[PDB]
Amino acid sequence: SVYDAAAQLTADVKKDLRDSWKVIGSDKKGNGVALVTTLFADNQETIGYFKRLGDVSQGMANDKLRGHSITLMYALQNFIDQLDNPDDLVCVVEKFAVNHITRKISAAEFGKINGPIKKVLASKNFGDKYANAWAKLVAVVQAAL
Amino acid sequence: SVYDAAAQLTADVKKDLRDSWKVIGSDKKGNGVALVTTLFADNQETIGYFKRLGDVSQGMANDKLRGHSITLMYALQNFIDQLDNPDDLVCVVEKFAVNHITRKISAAEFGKINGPIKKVLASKNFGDKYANAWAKLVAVVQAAL
Ligand code: HEM
Numbered sequence: 008s009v010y011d012a013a014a015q016l017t018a019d020v021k022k023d024l025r026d027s028w029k030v031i032g033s034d035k036k037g038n039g040v041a042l043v044t045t046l047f048a049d050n051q052e053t054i055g056y057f058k059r060l061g062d063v064s065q066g067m068a069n070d071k072l073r074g075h076s077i078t079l080m081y082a083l084q085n086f087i088d089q090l091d092n093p094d095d096l097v098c099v100v101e102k103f104a105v106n107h108i109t110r111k112i113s114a115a116e117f118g119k120i121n122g123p124i125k126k127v128l129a130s131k132n133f134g135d136k137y138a139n140a141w142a143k144l145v146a147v148v149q150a151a152l
Numbered sequence: 153s154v155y156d157a158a159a160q161l162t163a164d165v166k167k168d169l170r171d172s173w174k175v176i177g178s179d180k181k182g183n184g185v186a187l188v189t190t191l192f193a194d195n196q197e198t199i200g201y202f203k204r205l206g207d208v209s210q211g212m213a214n215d216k217l218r219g220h221s222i223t224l225m226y227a228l229q230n231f232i233d234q235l236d237n238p239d240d241l242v243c244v245v246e247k248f249a250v251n252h253i254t255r256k257i258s259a260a261e262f263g264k265i266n267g268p269i270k271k272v273l274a275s276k277n278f279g280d281k282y283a284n285a286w287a288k289l290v291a292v293v294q295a296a297l
Pocket residue numbers: 053056057059060075078079080082083103106107110112116117118119120247250251
């Protein structure tokens with residue numbers, strides 16, 4: 008369950024999430040677009056869910072893609088801010104899951120973001136230690152899907 | 153259309169939005185819930201759109217309502233951060249309007265959030281000057297609905 012997954016966020020895992028987000032969250036537009044573009048490049052099969060965004064290969068030039076990428080980063084900002092209170096983190100995660108469930112996005116499908124996240128982290132000098140920490144957070148969301 | 157509304161966001165308006173948000177946004181859970189509950193209190197009819205949240209009379213204690221309230225504040229955080237770049241503000245506002253348009257929420261209906269905002273600002277001692285500034289930001293969103 009999501010409640011069991013949330014308990015997986017140990018002291019150091021939360022610390023690593025904060026330290027890394029401090030750098031990544033500094034540039035939501037740049038890192039957000041890089042994250043979304045990397046997802047479409049590594050998993051072209053997911054592009055079907057974003058028909059509304061149009062020509063996704065335009066990247067930063069695509070207004071809809073840029074709007075989505077920036078907004079996405081604020082959802083991560085939300086999760087990071089709720090790390091202190093497990094009860095709040097959970098209600099925020101379930102709230103976030105509603106729309107993804109409606110779009111029939113499965114836990115396995117959502118888990119494809121781990122690759123893009125690991126690469127963005129690496130580009131900022133954050134290794135496996137941090138990629139694994141973020142996979143833990145992503146796992147909390149997967150448990151709600 | 154959204155661009156024209158964004159033009160009303162003058163240097164002074166953006167200054168007041170940033171100063172008031174520095175306080176309001178410091179407690180997203182507390183002020184977020186205050187906003188939503190005040191909306192339901194002053195405009196009971198808007199409750200028809202939130203059947204999913206369950207017993208909204210529980211307020212803060214309601215996990216779904218608390219989860220929604222907190223998340224709502226991050227949309228505002230998003231807008232406030234994009235104030236200096238009209239292009240990003242516009243793409244983020246249009247991205248935000250997509251789901252509200254699907255819910256059949258007209259600009260008039262959305263405008264009902266102005267009252268609650270004015271009251272929340274007043275509780276922190278922010279006069280009409282700030283209430284008008286925020287009414288202009290909401291106007292940008294209304295232009296997208
Ligand atoms: C780090 C992970 C992710 C985050 C933080 C995230 C965040 C968001 C946010 C904040 C929205 C806007 C609110 C909403 O409508 O739900 C959204 C929309 C959406 N998400 Fe997710 N999402 C993530 C991963 C994914 C993945 C992996 C898929 C699909 C493979 C997906 C598909 C969608 C779609 C289709 C939309 C609508 C896009 C549009 O039409 O503008 N999301 N997501």
